PDB file of C-alpha atoms in Angstrom:
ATOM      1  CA  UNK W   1     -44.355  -4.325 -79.205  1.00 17.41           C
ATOM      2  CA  UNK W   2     -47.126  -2.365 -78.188  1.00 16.77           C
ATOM      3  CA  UNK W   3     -49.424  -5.584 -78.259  1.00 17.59           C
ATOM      4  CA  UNK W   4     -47.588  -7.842 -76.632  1.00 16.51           C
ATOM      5  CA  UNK W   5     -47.263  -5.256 -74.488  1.00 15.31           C
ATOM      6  CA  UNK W   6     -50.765  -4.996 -73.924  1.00 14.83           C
ATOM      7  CA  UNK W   7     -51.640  -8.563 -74.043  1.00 12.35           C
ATOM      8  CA  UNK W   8     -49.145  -9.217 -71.134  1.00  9.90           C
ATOM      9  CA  UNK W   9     -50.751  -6.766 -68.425  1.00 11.28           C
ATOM     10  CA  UNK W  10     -53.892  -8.156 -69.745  1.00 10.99           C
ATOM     11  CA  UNK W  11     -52.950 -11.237 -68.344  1.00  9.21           C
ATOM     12  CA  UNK W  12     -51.365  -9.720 -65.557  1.00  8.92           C
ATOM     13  CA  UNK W  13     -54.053  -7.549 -64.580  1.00  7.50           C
ATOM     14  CA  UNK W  14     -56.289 -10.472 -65.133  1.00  7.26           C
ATOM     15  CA  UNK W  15     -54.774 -12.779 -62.838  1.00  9.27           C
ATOM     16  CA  UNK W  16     -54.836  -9.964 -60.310  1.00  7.46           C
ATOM     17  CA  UNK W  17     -58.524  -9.065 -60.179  1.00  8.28           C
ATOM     18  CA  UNK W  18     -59.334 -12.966 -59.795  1.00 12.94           C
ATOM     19  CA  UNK W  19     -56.896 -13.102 -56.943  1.00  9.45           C
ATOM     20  CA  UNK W  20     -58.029  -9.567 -55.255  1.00 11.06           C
ATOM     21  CA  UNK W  21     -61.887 -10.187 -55.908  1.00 13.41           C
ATOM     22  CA  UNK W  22     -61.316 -12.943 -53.372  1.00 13.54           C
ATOM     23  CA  UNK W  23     -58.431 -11.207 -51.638  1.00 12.75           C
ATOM     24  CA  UNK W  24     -61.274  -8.446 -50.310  1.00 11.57           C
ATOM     25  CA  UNK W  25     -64.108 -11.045 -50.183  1.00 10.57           C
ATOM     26  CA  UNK W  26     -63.411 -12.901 -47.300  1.00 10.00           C
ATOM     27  CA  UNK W  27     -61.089 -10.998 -45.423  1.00  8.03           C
ATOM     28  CA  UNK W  28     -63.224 -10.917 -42.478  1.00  7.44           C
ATOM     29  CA  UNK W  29     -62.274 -13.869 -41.056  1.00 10.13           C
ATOM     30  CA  UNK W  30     -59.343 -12.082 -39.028  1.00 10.85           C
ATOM     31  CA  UNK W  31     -62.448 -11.740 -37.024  1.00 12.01           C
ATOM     32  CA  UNK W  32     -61.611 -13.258 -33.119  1.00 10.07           C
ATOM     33  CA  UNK W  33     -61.119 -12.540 -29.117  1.00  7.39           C
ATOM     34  CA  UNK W  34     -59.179 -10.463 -27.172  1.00  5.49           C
ATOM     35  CA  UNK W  35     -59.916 -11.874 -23.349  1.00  5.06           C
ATOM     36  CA  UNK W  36     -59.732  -9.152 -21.599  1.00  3.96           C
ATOM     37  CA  UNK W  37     -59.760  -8.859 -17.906  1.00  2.00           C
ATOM     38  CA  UNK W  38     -62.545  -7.672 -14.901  1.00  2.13           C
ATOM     39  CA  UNK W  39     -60.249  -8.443 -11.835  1.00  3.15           C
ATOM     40  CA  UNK W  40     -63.923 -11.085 -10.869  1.00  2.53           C
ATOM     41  CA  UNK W  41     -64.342  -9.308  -8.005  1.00  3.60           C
ATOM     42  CA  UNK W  42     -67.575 -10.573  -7.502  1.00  2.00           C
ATOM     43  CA  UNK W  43     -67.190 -14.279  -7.105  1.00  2.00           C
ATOM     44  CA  UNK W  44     -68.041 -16.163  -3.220  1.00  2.22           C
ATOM     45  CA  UNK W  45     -69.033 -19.924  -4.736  1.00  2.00           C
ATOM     46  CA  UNK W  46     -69.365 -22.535  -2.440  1.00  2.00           C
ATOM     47  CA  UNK W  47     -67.151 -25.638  -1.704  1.00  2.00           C
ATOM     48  CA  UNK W  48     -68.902 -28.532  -3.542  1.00  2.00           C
ATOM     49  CA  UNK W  49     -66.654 -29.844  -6.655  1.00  2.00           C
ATOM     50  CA  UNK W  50     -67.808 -33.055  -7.094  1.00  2.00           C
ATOM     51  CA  UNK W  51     -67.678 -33.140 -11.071  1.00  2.00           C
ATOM     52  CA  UNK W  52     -63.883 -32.168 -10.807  1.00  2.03           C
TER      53      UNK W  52
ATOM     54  CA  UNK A   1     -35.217 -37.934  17.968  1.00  2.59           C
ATOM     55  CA  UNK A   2     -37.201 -34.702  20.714  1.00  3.74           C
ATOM     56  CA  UNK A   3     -36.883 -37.363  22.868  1.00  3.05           C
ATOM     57  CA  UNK A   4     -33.465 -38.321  22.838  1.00  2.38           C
ATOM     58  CA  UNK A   5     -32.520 -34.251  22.714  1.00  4.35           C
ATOM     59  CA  UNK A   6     -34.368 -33.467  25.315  1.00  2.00           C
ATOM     60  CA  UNK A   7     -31.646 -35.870  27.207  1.00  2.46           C
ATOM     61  CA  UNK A   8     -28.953 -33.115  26.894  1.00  2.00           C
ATOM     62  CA  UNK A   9     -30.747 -30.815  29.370  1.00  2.00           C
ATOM     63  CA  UNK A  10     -31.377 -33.683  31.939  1.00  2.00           C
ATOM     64  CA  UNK A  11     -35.186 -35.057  31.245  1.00  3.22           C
ATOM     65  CA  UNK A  12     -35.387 -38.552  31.001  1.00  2.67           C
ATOM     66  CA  UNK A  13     -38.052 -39.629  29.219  1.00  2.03           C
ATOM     67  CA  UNK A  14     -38.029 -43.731  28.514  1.00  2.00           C
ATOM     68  CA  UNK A  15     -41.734 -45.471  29.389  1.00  2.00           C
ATOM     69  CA  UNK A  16     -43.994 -45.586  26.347  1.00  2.70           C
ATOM     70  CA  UNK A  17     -46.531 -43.768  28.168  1.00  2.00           C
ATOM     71  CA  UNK A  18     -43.881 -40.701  28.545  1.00  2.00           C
ATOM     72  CA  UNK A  19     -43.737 -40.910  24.533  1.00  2.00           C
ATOM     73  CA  UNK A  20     -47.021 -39.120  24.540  1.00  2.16           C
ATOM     74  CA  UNK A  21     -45.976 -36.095  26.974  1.00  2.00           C
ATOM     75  CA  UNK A  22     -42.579 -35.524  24.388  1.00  2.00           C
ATOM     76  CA  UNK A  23     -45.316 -35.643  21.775  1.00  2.00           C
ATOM     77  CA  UNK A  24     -47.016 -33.028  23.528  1.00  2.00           C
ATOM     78  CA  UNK A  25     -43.970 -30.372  23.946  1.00  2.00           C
ATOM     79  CA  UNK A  26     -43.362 -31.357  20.141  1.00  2.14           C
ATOM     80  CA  UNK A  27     -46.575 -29.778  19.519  1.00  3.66           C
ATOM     81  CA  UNK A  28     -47.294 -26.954  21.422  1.00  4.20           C
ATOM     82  CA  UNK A  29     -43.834 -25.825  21.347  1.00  5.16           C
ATOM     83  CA  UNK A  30     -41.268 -26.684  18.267  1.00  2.52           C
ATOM     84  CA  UNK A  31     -41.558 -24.851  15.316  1.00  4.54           C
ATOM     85  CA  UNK A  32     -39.258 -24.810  12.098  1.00  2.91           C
ATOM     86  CA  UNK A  33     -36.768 -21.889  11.517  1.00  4.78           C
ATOM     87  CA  UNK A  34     -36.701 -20.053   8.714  1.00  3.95           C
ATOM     88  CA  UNK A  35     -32.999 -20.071   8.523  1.00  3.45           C
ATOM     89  CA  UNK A  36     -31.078 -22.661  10.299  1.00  6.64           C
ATOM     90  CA  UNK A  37     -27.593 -21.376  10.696  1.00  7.41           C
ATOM     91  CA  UNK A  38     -28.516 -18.047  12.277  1.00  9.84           C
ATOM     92  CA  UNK A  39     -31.254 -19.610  14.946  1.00  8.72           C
ATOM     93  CA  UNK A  40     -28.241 -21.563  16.258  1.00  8.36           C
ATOM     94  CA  UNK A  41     -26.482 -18.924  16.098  1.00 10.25           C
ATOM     95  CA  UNK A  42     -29.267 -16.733  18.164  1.00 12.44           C
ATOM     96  CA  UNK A  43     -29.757 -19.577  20.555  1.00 10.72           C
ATOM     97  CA  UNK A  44     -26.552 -19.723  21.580  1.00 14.93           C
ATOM     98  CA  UNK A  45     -26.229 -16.071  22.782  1.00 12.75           C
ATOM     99  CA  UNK A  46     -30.000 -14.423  23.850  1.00 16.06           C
ATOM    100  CA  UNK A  47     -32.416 -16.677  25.694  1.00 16.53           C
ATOM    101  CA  UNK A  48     -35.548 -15.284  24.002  1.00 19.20           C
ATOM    102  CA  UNK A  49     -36.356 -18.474  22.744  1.00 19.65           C
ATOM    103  CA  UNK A  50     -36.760 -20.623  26.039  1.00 19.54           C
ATOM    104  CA  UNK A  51     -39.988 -21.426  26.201  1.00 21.16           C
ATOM    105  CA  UNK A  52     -41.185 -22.934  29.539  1.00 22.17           C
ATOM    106  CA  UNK A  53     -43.622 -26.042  29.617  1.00 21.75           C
ATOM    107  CA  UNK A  54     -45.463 -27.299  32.726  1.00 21.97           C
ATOM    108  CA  UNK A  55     -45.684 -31.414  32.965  1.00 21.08           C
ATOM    109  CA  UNK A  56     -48.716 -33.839  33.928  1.00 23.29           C
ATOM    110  CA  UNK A  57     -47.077 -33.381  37.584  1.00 24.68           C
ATOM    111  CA  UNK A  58     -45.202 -30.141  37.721  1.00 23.58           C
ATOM    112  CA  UNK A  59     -41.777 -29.445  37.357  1.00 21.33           C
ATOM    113  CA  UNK A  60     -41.730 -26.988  34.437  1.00 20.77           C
ATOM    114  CA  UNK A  61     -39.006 -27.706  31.943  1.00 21.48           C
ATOM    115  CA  UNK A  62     -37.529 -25.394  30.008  1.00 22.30           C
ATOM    116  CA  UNK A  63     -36.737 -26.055  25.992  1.00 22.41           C
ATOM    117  CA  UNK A  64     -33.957 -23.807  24.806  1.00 20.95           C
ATOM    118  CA  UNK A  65     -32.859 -24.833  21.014  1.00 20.40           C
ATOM    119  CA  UNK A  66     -34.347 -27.851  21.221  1.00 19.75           C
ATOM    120  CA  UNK A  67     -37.379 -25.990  19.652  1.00 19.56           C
ATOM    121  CA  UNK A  68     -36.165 -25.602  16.456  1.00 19.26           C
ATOM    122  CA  UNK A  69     -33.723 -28.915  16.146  1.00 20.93           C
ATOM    123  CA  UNK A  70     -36.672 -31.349  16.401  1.00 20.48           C
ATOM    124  CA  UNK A  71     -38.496 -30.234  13.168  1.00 19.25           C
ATOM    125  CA  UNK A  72     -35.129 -29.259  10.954  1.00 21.66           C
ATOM    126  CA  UNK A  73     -34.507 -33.762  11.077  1.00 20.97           C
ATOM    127  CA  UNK A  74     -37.176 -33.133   8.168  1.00 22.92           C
ATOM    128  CA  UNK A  75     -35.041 -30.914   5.912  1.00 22.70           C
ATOM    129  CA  UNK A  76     -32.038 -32.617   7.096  1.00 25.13           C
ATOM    130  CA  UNK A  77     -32.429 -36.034   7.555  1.00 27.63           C
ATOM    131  CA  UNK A  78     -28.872 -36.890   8.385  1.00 26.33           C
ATOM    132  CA  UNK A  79     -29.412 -36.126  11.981  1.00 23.53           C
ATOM    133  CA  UNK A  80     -31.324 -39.498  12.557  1.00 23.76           C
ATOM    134  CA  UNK A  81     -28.582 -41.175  10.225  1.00 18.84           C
ATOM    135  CA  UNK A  82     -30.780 -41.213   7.289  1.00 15.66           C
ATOM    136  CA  UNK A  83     -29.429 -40.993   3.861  1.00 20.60           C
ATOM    137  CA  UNK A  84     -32.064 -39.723   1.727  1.00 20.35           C
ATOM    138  CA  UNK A  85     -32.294 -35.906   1.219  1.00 22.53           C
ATOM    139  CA  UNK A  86     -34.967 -33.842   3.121  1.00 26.42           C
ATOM    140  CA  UNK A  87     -38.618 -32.845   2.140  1.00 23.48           C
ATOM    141  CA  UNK A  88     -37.444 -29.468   0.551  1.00 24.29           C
ATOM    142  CA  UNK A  89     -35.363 -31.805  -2.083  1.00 24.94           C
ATOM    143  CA  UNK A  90     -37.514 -35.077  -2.426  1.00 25.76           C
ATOM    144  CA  UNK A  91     -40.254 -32.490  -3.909  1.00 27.15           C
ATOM    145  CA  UNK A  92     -37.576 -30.914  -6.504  1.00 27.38           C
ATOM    146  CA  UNK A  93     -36.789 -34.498  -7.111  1.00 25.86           C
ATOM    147  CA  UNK A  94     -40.119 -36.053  -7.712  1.00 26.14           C
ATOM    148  CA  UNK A  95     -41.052 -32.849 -10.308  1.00 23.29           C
ATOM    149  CA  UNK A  96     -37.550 -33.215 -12.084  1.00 21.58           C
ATOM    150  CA  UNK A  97     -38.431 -36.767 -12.955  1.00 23.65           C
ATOM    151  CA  UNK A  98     -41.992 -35.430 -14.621  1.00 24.88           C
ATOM    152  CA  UNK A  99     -42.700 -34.505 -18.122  1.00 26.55           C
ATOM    153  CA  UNK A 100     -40.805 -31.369 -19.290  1.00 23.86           C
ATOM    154  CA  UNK A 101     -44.183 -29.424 -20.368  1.00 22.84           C
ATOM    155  CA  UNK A 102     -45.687 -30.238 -16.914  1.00 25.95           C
ATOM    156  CA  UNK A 103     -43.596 -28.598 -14.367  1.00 28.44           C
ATOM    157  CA  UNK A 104     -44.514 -25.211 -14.295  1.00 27.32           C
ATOM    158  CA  UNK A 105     -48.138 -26.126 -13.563  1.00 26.45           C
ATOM    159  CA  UNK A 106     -46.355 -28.541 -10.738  1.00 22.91           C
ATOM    160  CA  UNK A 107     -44.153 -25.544  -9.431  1.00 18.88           C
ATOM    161  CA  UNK A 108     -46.976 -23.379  -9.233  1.00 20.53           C
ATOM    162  CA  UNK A 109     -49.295 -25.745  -7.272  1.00 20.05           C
ATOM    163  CA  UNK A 110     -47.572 -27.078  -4.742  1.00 17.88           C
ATOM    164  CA  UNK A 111     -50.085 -28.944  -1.905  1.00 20.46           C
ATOM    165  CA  UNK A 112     -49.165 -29.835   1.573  1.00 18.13           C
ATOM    166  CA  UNK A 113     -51.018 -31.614   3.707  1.00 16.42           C
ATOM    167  CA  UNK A 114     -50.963 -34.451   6.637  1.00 17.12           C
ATOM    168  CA  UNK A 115     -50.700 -33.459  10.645  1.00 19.64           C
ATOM    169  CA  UNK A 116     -46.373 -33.075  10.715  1.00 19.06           C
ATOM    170  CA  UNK A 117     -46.504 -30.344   7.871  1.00 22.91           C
ATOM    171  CA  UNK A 118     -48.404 -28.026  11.139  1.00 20.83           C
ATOM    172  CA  UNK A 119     -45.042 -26.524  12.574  1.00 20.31           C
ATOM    173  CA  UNK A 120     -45.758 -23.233  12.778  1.00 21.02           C
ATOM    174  CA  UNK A 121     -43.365 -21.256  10.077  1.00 18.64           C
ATOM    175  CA  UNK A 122     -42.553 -24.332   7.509  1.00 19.27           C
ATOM    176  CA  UNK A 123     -44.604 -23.386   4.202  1.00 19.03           C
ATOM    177  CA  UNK A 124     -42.341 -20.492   4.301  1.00 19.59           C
ATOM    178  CA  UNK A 125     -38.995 -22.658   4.746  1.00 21.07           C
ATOM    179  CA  UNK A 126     -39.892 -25.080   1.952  1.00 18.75           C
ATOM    180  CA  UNK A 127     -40.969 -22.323  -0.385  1.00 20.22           C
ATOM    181  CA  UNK A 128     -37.277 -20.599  -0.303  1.00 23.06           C
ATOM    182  CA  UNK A 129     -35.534 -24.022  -0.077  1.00 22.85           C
ATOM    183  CA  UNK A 130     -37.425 -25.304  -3.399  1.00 20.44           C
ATOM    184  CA  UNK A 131     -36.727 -21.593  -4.667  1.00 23.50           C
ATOM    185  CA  UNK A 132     -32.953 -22.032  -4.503  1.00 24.35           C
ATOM    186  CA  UNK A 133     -33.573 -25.264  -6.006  1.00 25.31           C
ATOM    187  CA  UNK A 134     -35.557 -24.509  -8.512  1.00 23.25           C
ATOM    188  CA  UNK A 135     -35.180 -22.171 -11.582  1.00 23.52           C
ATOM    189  CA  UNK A 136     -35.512 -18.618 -11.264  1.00 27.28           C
ATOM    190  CA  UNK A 137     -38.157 -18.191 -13.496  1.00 28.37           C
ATOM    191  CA  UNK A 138     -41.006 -20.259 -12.521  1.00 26.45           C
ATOM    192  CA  UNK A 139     -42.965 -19.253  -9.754  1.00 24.77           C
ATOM    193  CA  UNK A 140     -43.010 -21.511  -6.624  1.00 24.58           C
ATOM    194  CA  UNK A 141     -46.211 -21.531  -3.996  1.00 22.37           C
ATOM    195  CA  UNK A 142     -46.989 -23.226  -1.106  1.00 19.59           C
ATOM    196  CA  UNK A 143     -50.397 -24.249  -0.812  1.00 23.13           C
ATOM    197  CA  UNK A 144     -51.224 -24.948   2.988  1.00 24.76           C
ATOM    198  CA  UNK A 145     -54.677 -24.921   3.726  1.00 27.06           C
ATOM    199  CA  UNK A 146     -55.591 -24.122   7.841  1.00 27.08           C
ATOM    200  CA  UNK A 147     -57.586 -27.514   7.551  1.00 23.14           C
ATOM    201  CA  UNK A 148     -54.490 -28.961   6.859  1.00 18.68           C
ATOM    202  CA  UNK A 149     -54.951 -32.196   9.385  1.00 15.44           C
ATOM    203  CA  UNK A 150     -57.951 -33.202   7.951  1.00 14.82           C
ATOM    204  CA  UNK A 151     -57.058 -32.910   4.481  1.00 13.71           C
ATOM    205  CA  UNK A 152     -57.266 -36.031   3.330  1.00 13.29           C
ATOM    206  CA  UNK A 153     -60.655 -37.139   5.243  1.00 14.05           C
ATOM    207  CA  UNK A 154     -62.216 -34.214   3.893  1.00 14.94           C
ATOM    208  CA  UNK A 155     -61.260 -35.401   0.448  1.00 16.08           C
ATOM    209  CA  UNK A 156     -62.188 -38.746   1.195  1.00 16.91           C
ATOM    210  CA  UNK A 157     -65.619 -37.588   1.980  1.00 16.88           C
ATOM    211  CA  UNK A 158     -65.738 -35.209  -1.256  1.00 17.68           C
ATOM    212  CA  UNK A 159     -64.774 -38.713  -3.378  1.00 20.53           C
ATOM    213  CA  UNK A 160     -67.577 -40.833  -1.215  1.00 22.71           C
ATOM    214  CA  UNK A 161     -69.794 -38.222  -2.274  1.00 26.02           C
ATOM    215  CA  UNK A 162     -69.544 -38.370  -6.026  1.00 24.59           C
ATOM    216  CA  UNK A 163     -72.447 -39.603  -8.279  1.00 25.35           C
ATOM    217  CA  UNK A 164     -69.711 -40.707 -10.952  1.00 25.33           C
ATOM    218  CA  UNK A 165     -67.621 -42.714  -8.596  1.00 22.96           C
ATOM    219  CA  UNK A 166     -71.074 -44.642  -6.940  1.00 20.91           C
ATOM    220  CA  UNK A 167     -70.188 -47.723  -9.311  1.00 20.00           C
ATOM    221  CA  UNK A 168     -66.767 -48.037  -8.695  1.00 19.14           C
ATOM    222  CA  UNK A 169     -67.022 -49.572  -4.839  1.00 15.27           C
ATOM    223  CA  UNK A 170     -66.147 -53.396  -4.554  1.00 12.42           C
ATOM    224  CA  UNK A 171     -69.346 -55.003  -4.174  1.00 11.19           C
ATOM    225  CA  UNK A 172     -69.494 -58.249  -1.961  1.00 11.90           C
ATOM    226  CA  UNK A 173     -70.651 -60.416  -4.862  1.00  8.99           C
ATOM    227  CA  UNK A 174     -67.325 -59.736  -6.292  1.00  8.94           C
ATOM    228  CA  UNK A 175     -64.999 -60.350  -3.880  1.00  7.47           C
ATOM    229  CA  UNK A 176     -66.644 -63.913  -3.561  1.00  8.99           C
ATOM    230  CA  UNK A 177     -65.961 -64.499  -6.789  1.00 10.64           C
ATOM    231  CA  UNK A 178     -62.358 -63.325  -7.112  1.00 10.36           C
ATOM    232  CA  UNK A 179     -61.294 -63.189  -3.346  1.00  7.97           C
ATOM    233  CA  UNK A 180     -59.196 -61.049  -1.645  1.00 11.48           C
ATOM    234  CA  UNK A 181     -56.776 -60.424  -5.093  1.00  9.00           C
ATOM    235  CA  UNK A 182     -59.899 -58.465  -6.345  1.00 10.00           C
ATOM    236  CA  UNK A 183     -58.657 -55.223  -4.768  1.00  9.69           C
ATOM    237  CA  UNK A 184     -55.384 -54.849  -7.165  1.00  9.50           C
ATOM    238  CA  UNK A 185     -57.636 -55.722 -10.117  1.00 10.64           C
ATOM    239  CA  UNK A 186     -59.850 -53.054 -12.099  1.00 12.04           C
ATOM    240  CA  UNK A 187     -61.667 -52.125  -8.961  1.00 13.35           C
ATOM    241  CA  UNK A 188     -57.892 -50.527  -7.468  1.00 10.72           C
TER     242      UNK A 188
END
């Protein structure tokens, strides 16, 4: 009992490490914008849209 | 249809040349009300609203709620006998029959334009009209420009300007070959 015990959270434990070596790996990927705001106080273009 | 108001005071105006002067008054002196019922209403009992106007030859006339009458045949076009609906409802009508995922951007830019959309006081009446159309969610505005008479030349010049649009013009050596029919072909 003890062995199969043993050889089961072998296998478990296993399985776990080859998921959670990648699990931690790449996990900066979450990694993106937040588009914040400045209120673009600051813009006085001109009237010339010709490319649309 | 200021014209053939104007007969309920006692000015006659018939000759073609007196069209222009009833253009005139409609100019300088109509404007649209915000609220119909209640300007009648006011009309009918103060007489802040006459406003007096001085013809080619004298003779001031004065225009009591004839002022606001002219410019409401637009929002309610049975007063000339037309069917259709007014301006404030043709608009609601041409955005209902649009794409489902394209009318908020539609309710939110709304673009007037041409000389009779000038009457001082109407970007507000259309805005509340197409608000009690409307849903109550999406946001309805009014974009009226000052330049709003010369809109569409300014635009015109903007599109004459373009590099990109250089090669579209109808060149001479086309319409020989095609004739006149070339114009509803590629080159629209």
């Amino acid at each position: 009992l003890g062995t199969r015990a043993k050889e089961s959270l072998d296998l478990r434990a296993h399985l776990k490490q080859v998921k959670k070596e990648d699990i931690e790996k790449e996990n900066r990927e979450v990694g993106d914008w937040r588009k914040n705001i400045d209120a673009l106080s600051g813009m006085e273009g001109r009237k010339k849209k010709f490319e649309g | 249809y200021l014209m053939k108001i104007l007969t309920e005071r006692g000015y006659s105006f018939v000759t073609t040349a007196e069209r222009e002067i009833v253009r005139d008054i409609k100019e300088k002196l109509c404007y649209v009300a915000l609220d119909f019922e209640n300007e009648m209403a006011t009309a009918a009992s103060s007489s802040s609203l006459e406003k007096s106007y001085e013809l080619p030859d004298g003779q001031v006339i004065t225009i009591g709620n004839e002022r606001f009458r002219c410019p409401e045949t637009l929002f309610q076009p049975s007063f000339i006998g037309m069917e259709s609906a007014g301006i404030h409802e043709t608009t609601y009508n041409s955005i209902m029959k649009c794409d489902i995922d394209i009318r908020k951007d539609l309710y939110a830019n709304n673009v007037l334009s041409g000389g009779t959309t000038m009457y001082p006081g109407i970007a507000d009446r259309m805005q509340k009209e197409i608000t009690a159309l409307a849903p109550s969610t999406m946001k309805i505005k009014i974009i009226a420009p000052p330049e709003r008479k010369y809109s569409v030349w300014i635009g015109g010049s903007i599109l004459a300007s373009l590099s990109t649009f250089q090669q579209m013009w109808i060149s001479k050596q086309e319409y020989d070959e095609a004739g006149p029919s070339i114009v509803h072909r590629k080159c629209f």
